[PDB]
Design a binder for these strands. Structure first.
Ligand SMILES: [Mg+2]
Ligand SMILES: [Mg+2]
Ligand SMILES: [Mg+2]
Lengths: 87, 95, 197, 132, 243, 95, 64
RNA sequence: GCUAAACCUAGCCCCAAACCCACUCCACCUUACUACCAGACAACCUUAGCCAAACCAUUUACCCAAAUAAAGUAUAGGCGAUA
RNA sequence: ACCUCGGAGCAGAACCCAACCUCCGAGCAGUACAUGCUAAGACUUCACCAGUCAAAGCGAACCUCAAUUGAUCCA
């Protein structure tokens, strides 16, 4: 008997139907398309410009990083201040 | 005690031994002697320091603590300037 | 172990040694999920050591620094955060995501003096003081200071990455692709301003 | 959408970053024993009833083993050929050290020896001067 | 055995398949928005990340709303963004004591208010928070129009919104006889809240009365086979006379 | 509108997934009732002059009670909002 | 050339495609993955089962 | 030798895949399956408790939206069981 | 009536040994203020908890009694 054909990964991206509920939302998410781009090259048809953050996303990111992660100047300033206090 | 979890189906540690004891990768356990901060005025100083000092544990309660704790607390850790690296590993032992 | 790896020939000392090459040679496995900020050098193996390598590291003991400087190598520390260390120690899984090269960040409130001291060979420390520290270490451990300025590969030895840059070739904001191999920059003013900030 | 620009010239760094998948044949050091006490196998190999192969990392297949916390032994893993000659040879080699003949355990199926006590460094030097 | 779809998808699959399938898209989008309400019964954390005082380390935080109870009279009469809080508490604010089944219900007030668009004086059970927020909105109708639906949580308020938007879209003289000046002034003041007539009609309705209105729209006596066949036959005879 | 907060800490959840609840979280404590809080007089512009308050075109802060009672229903005053305060100030300038 | 793994080849239920475990772990995985699609009475029986199995494995038996 | 004995089918369980049901001859909410008359009658409420803690009184997982992993970690907790 | 600790006998001579067996007691007190820090090696109230002795060294001068008492969390 000829053996059944060898099972193989589906060639090409996997673009599900968004108007289909049982399909999870993490496929419709953009990170999915980014993964498919990085995997199957530009053949996916995904626009490259979409993966970068929008200006709003960049704004929130710079805001949170400026708020939480300080800079070297302020860092060394606080170091000097606390060292002087200890002294 | 909780040999199988409800959400993941895994063992679960009691944080009691985590707060009270310490494990060394050799398989040993240390502990702060009890009553080391209570009623120090009546106790003689030799007793005070016998209470202050660390000590080890029996093999029985050692393996009991091991049984209730999980492998995360039995793993090798490389801390910075942690004084117990001198003692995690054993030297010049037989039998 | 470093001598073992180099004389087995898995890591090329002619090429600048760094954490990526170490992890590819399997000299050290890393578990950033277990909050291991990197790799440290230790005093063991000072003898029988002829590396000459330009090792990149996070921690460094004075014995290892002195031995490498005696054999003519180069030692300098480089703080990586957990996520940066993850991208470094497993680059391909990150490139399968398609999101751009992240940016390193400065050390936390504690390790800035450490990575800024010159005796430490911190990448943030001044270069003007590195000769001084090399001189004190030589004067300490009784070995002449070999001027590596003469050899042909002083350029290789002084190849270094500035902070907020993961790889010697790549920079943050860059996007890499291997299927239909390409590299992509934004060339947008705001984006590049951020990725340089 | 944001703009972008493409390049291919900077792919050499990525090619460098790509990891390896086979152990490389070590380089030819002009003088041996190279540091770390490594010594490649002699060529041609020795004509003997048996032969010991190296590991993936081109090391000798001696190892140690501990069991019950006290049983303290060393094993030879991948002896090819007549392992009985080899076990007799190591017995004759180690008899003067202990004053007694070991009672080693041979598994000629896998080609393994199992000897009480640690003799890893001694057996390594022995197999090196034999040229395996 | 198992179902093809989960249970919590059955209701939306029904929304997509049936009488409601003929409904427009904007109404479905509005009812499926599921937008978070304004917090009234707890202080929301100003930031998503927060540093606890125990250890000097970051800790993500996410506010959690309270399961408020909305009685029927609350929907009948505009209360605001509040309702009965059903829960339980420890006695003497001591964890290590007796737990007790507790119920909080706000202080209601029966007050009169007037609106220039509806031109009618209504009586409703309202609250201090309602009064304060309408004062912040600088008038009742402003709040009734600018209310995110989940914050208003009152079908009476939603019906007021429906009627008001409908009147703004129609620009009817029904409101101000003999005062076109006042009419136009008010419509210009509230010009920006305006939306299409069909949108104003559909807004402020649950799916039940939505499908009811859809049925009242679609329903009509069937045209007789006799009539359609007369039409087809006249067409055929015209074609034959042409040929 | 009483304000409350949970005695127990809720297990943190994802941004896309809603949290698990339990009566351990149903339990509450009272933090503030925001009715004992001291009132804040609201600003309003009165058209018709009245005793001790002000005159036409004038703005003033007054009690919520009185304002909600007699000013607004009578149609005398209006909200101090940018829709009309510019009209008030420009007619004042005209005067 | 390592295009696929032998675990995704087996034909079977969805809560076990390349997985092994005792009955407790199996039932909790089944509810975690399929409980939404499950019938009401079957889900109730499964909850009762995980409850009984928790009680048994954690409270009952030797070796404690 | 009787009483008896033997049978192998009906069908059933778990999965997978796929979403699913309604005489439209008469009758059926009054006392259902009953041909025919003046009412103003309408739903929206925390689950608790056993058990465990070797008593019990705070507490004791029971889903609600990607499988694995981080992780049984950070945390909570008569800082106990346990979560 | 008792519930913990110590001494004596039963238990005569290395250790241990119970009884609602026979007797006496304790739940402190007093003197210094190096009643400081460290540390080999050992005993151990039949387990664990606890409880004991202590060479040497640094630093210093030139404890008695028999029990004389209470873990963890927590404040
Ligand atoms: Mg082994
Ligand atoms: Mg003993
Ligand atoms: Mg002495």
């Amino acid at each position: 008997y000829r053996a059944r054909p060898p099972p193989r990964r589906r060639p090409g991206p996997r673009w599900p139907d968004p108007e289909d509920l049982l399909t999870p939302r993490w496929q419709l998410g953009p990170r999915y398309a980014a993964k498919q781009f990085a995997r199957y090259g530009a053949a996916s048809g995904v626009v490259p410009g979409s993966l970068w953050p929008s200006p709003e996303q960049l704004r929130e990111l710079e805001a949170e990083e400026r708020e939480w992660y300080p800079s070297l100047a302020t860092m060394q300033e606080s170091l000097r201040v606390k060292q002087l206090a200890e002294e | 005690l909780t040999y199988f979890s409800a959400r993941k189906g895994k063992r679960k540690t009691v944080k009691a031994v985590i707060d009270r004891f310490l494990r060394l990768h050799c398989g040993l356990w240390v502990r702060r002697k009890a009553g080391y901060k209570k009623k120090l005025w009546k106790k003689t100083p030799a007793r005070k320091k016998r209470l202050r000092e660390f000590v080890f544990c029996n093999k029985t309660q050692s393996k009991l603590l091991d049984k209730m704790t999980t492998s995360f607390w039995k793993r090798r850790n490389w801390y910075v300037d942690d004084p117990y690296q001198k003692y995690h590993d054993r030297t010049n032992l037989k039998v | 172990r470093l001598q073992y790896l180099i004389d087995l020939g898995r890591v090329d000392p002619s090429q600048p040694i760094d954490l990526t090459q170490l992890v590819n040679g399997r000299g050290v496995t890393i578990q950033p999920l277990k909050r291991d900020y990197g790799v440290q050098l230790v005093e063991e193996g000072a003898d029988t050591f002829t590396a000459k390598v330009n090792i990149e590291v996070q921690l460094a003991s004075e014995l290892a620094i002195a031995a490498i400087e005696k054999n003519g190598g180069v030692v300098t520390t480089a703080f990586y955060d957990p996520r940066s260390l993850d991208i470094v120690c497993k680059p391909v899984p990150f490139f399968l995501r398609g999101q751009p090269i992240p940016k390193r960040m400065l050390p936390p409130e504690e390790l800035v003096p450490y990575y800024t001291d010159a005796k430490n060979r911190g990448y943030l420390a001044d270069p003007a003081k590195f000769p001084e520290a090399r001189l004190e270490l030589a004067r300490k451990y009784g070995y002449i200071l070999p001027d590596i300025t003469k050899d042909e590969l002083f350029k290789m030895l002084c190849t270094r990455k500035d902070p907020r840059q993961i790889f010697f070739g790549l920079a943050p904001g860059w996007v890499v692709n291997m299927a239909d191999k390409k590299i992509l920059k934004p060339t947008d003013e705001n984006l590049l301003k951020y990725y340089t900030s | 959408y944001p703009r972008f620009v493409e390049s291919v010239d900077e792919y050499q760094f990525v090619e460098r970053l790509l990891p390896a998948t086979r152990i490389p044949d070590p380089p030819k050091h002009e003088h041996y024993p190279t540091p770390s006490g490594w010594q490649p196998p002699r060529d041609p190999p020795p004509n003997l009833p048996y032969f010991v192969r190296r590991s993936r990392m081109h090391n000798i297949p001696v190892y140690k083993d501990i069991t019950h916390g006290n049983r303290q032994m060393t094993v030879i893993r991948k002896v090819e050929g007549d392992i009985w000659a080899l076990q007799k040879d190591v017995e004759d080699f180690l008899s003067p050290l202990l004053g007694k003949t070991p009672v080693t355990q041979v598994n000629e199926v896998t080609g393994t020896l199992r000897i009480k006590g640690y003799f890893d460094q001694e057996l390594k030097a022995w197999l090196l001067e034999k040229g395996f | 055995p198992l179902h093809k779809y989960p249970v919590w998808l059955w209701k939306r699959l029904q929304l997509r398949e049936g009488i409601c399938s003929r409904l427009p898209g904007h109404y479905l989008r509005s009812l499926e928005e599921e937008r978070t309400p304004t917090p009234v019964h707890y202080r929301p954390h100003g930031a998503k990340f927060k540093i606890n005082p125990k250890n000097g380390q970051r800790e993500r935080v996410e506010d959690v709303p309270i399961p408020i109870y909305f009685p029927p009279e609350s929907q009948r009469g505009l209360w605001g963004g509040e309702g009965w809080i059903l829960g339980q508490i420890y006695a003497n604010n001591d964890k290590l004591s007796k737990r007790l089944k507790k119920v909080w219900k706000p202080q209601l007030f029966e007050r009169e208010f007037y609106s220039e668009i509806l031109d009618k004086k209504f009586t409703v059970t309202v609250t201090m928070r309602t009064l304060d927020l309408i004062d912040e909105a600088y008038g009742l109708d402003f709040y009734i129009l600018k209310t995110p639906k989940e914050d208003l949580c009152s079908k009476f308020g939603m019906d007021l919104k429906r009627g008001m938007l409908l009147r703004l879209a129609r620009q009817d003289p029904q409101l101000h006889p003999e005062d076109p000046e006042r009419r136009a002034a008010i419509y210009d003041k509230y010009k920006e809240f305006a939306i299409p007539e069909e949108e104003a009609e559909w807004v402020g309705l649950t799916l039940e009365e939505a499908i009811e209105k859809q049925r009242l729209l679609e329903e009509k006596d069937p045209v007789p086979l006799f009539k359609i066949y007369v039409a087809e036959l006249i067409q055929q005879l015209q074609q034959q006379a042409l040929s | 509108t009483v304000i409350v907060e949970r005695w127990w800490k809720v297990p943190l959840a994802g941004e896309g997934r809603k949290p698990r609840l339990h009566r351990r979280h149903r339990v509450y404590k009272l933090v503030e009732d925001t009715k004992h809080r001291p009132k804040e007089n609201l600003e309003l512009i009165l058209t018709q002059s009245v005793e001790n308050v002000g005159v036409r075109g004038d703005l003033v802060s007054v009690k919520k009670s009185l304002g909600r009672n007699r000013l607004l229903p009578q149609g005398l005053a209006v909200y101090a909002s940018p829709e009309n305060k510019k009209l008030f100030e420009e007619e004042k300038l005209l005067r | 050339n390592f295009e696929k793994h032998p675990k995704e080849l087996i034909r079977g239920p969805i809560w076990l495609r390349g997985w092994k475990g005792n009955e407790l772990q199996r039932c909790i995985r089944k509810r975690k993955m399929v409980g939404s699609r499950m019938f009401a009475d079957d889900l109730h029986n499964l909850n009762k089962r995980i409850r009984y199995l928790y009680k048994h494995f954690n409270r009952h038996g030797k070796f404690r």
